[PDB]
Amino acid sequence: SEHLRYCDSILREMLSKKHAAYAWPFYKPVDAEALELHDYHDIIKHPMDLSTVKRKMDGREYPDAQGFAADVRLMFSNCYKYNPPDHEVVAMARKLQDVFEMRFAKMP
Numbered sequence: 001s002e003h004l005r006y007c008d009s010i011l012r013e014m015l016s017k018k019h020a021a022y023a024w025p026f027y028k029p030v031d032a033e034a035l036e037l038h039d040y041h042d043i044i045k046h047p048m049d050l051s052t053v054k055r056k057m058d059g060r061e062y063p064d065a066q067g068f069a070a071d072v073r074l075m076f077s078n079c080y081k082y083n084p085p086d087h088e089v090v091a092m093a094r095k096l097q098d099v100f101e102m103r104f105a106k107m108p
């Protein structure tokens, strides 16, 4: 669809080298074990990241743009909920969410 195609283009931009400096922590699920975030899955009950969004998009699991945006917004919401406010990953999430919300708002 026209809307889902636009979302795919947003997702491809978020995964592009343009934004790599701050998008890379969202490229794949938080590895709470390697990172030793022993409380991560107690605090975050529905983990989300960009590779999962991409898997669902490629498999055409999102019926509409709102479902796609719900997943992306959960990824960011998880990041703000879990981390200390001054963590570098929070500053990175702020920049990538700016990019995402600005593109999403201009969906034809």
Ligand SMILES: CCOC(=O)Nc1cc(-c2ccc(C)c(NS(C)(=O)=O)c2)nn2c(C)nnc12
Pocket: 025, 026, 027, 028, 029, 030, 031, 032, 035, 037, 078, 079, 082, 083, 084, 087, 089
């Ligand atoms: C108080 C300590 O807080 C944290 O370390 N927080 C977070 C850390 C990282 C993070 C760092 C380094 C690396 C190498 C990775 N890679 S991976 C395979 O997990 O995605 C991720 N992502 N992250 C995301 C999203 N949301 N929070 C965090």
